[PDB]
């Protein structure tokens, strides 16, 4: 399975690192893709294992939690108005504008999606489009990818 609806894409105002998690978690609650307190577990994992990815030009974060809190594979994408700091995933303060929240319970799907994410964020042309395109265009270009 995949699952990625149009209301799994949204912009966020000039927000806390914690607030971002909740904002993206809510549609995944509204469809039963995850447990009631999915955002709670995601937040806690981030404080121990940060997901900030230092890539230029657009900072990226991939917040998630253990697959045992998922019910159906899903992805939520957020575009931050102003850069919000995420701790570096490698222990090294990363300014993030794009957030890929992963609610994947299947390991092979987790590794497939992470592989795909890696290739996309290394494309500084598509990363730019994400900063200007709207909720429809972003959803459209992203949906194609299988």
């Amino acid at each position: 399975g995949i699952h990625f609806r149009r209301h799994y894409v949204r912009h966020l105002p000039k927000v806390s690192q914690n607030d971002i998690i909740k904002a993206l978690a809510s549609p995944l609650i509204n469809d039963g893709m995850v447990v009631s307190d999915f955002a709670d577990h995601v937040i806690t994992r981030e404080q121990n294992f940060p997901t900030g990815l230092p890539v230029e030009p657009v900072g990226v974060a991939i917040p998630h939690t253990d697959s045992k809190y998922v019910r159906q594979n899903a992805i939520s994408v957020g575009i931050l108005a102003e850069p919000v700091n995420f701790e570096d995933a490698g222990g090294e303060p990363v300014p993030v504008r794009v957030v890929f929240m992963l609610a994947l319970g299947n390991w092979f799907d987790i590794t497939n999606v992470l592989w795909w994410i890696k290739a996309v964020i290394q494309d500084e042309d598509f990363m730019q489009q994400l900063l200007v395109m709207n909720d429809d265009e972003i959803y459209q270009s992203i949906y194609t990818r299988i």
Epitope: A89, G105, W107, F108, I110, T111, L114, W115, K118
Partner: antibody, heavy 131, light 109 residues
């Protein structure tokens, strides 16, 4: 540390059947991936098969030599892993281990589906296939 | 299948030694490493890029390059006399796993 206890080993005739069991405690068994591994006498370790967890729908993968002959299952309610072995041959003889299996994927350098590693092992049960 | 290792390697007590493992799948996948002594269950030593389980001594370390992965023991002790097995995928992208044939480390002197 955690405890893995295999049993069911013994003597079986070629062509015969056998069922091994592994009892597990000390970790989250329901969410754990579990692997069977064997060691023929005087030889190395040989991966037999692995059963995944609920997110992967309990899917099982098998080594080529046992595919179609062996069946791995699990009973989570009592924390048991099983290996059901049909049409046994002499080359199936050996010490059979069950192992709690971790999954690893490095984001920047990894390739799907990452790697599995074996963090805890039982002591094994001995299977002898002979006439 | 088929990761491959030397059948045996020797090392002077207190000296450095490296055990190698080779295979196509190592181009894309990390190896994990196990120590095994006769009559005793395998012990995980090292896995992934740079991961050492908490109880494993610091002198064990792994590396990887091309189709090769290596376990280095920096200053071998008698207790390190054992069989060492590497493990990884059988092919790039495969859902199956495999072991190398094992390398016998003998500690001399």
């Amino acid at each position: 540390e955690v405890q893995l206890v295999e049993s069911g080993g013994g003597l079986v005739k070629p062509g015969g059947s056998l069922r091994l069991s592994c009892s597990a405690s000390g970790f989250d068994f329901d969410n754990a991936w579990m692997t069977w591994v064997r060691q023929p006498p005087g030889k190395g370790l040989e991966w037999v098969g692995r059963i995944t967890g609920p997110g992967e729908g309990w899917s099982v993968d098998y080594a080529a030599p046992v595919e179609g002959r062996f069946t791995i299952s699990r009973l989570n309610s009592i924390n048991f892993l099983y290996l059901e072995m049909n049409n046994l041959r002499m080359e199936d003889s050996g010490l059979y281990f069950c192992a709690r299996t971790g999954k690893y994927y490095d984001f920047w350098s990894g390739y799907p589906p990452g790697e599995e590693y074996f963090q805890d092992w039982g002591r094994g049960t001995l299977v002898t296939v002979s006439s | 299948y088929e990761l491959t290792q030397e059948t045996g390697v020797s090392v002077a007590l207190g000296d450095t030694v490296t055990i190698t493992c080779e295979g196509d799948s190592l181009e894309s996948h990390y190896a994990s490493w196990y120590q095994k002594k006769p009559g005793q269950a395998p012990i995980l030593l090292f896995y992934g890029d740079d991961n050492r389980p908490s109880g494993v001594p610091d002198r064990f370390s792994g590396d990887a390059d091309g189709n090769e992965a290596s376990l280095t023991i920096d200053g071998a002790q008698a207790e390190d006399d054992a069989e060492y097995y590497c493990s990884s995928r059988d092919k790039s992208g495969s859902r199956l796993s495999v072991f190398g044939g094992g390398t016998k480390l003998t500690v001399l002197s």
